[PDB]
Amino acid sequence: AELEVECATQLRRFGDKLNFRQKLL
Amino acid sequence: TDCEFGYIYRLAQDYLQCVLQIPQPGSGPSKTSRVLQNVAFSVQKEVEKNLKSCLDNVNVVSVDTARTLFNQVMEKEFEDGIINWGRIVTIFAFEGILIKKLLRQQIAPDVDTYKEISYFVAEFIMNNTGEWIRQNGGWENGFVKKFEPK
Numbered sequence: 001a002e003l004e005v006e007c008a009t010q011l012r013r014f015g016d017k018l019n020f021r022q023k024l025l
Numbered sequence: 026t027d028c029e030f031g032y033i034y035r036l037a038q039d040y041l042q043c044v045l046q047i048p049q050p051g052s053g054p055s056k057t058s059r060v061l062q063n064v065a066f067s068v069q070k071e072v073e074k075n076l077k078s079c080l081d082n083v084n085v086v087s088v089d090t091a092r093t094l095f096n097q098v099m100e101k102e103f104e105d106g107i108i109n110w111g112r113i114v115t116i117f118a119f120e121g122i123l124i125k126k127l128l129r130q131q132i133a134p135d136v137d138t139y140k141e142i143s144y145f146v147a148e149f150i151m152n153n154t155g156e157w158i159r160q161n162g163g164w165e166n167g168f169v170k171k172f173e174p175k
Contacts, residue, residue, distance in 0.1 A: 001097075003079055003082060003083055004094065004098050004101055005101055006076070006079045007076060007079065007080075007098045007101075007102075007119075008097075008098045008099070008100075008101030008102035009101070009102075010072065010075060010076055011072060011098065011102050011112075011115040011118070011119055012102045012105075012112065012115075014068055014071065014072055014111075014115055014118075015102070015109070015112035015113075015114065015115040016107075016109070016111055016112065017111070018064075018068060018111035018114060018115075019109040019110055019111025019112065020111070021111070022110070022111070022171055022172060023171050
């Protein structure tokens with residue numbers, strides 16, 4: 001399906017944006 | 026006393042109760058849970074609006090559909106072998122999105138469903154990120170230190 005991919009891809013990008021964004025050691 | 030299924034299940038359950046706005050005493054949520062409920066909800070709100078059209082095209086009519094959908098989505102999201110706190114946060118966000126759809130679309134309304142959601146959420150987190158979480162300070166020395174108020 002493209003819905004599970006569309007979901008996973010968007011969650012992934014948000015996840016990564018939130019991660020590098022938080023601390024910045 | 027952390028990094029175990031029970032602890033993660035309690036986190037996942039706390040977040041669902043918060044999303045659903047049902048009160049859970051027991052002397053209150055842990056500091057970890059409080060920090061998580063705050064940041065996860067922030068991600069849920071943004072992901073919901075960006076993923077709105079796509080989600081209208083799936084009917085979360087049962088706990089089994091929720092589980093399957095969750096597993097399929099989580100598998101694609103983590104298929105690259107990368108794990109980080111940002112990504113782990115999104116697991117809860119998506120958990121929140123799922124319970125909301127299930128509350129509105131579940132054919133046989135069950136008032137314990139959020140216990141079964143919390144279960145397979147913790148199950149996925151355990152089997153796929155448990156080792157990474159441990160090596161990175163767990164919830165109180167990893168997640169909390171990173172996401173608590175400055």
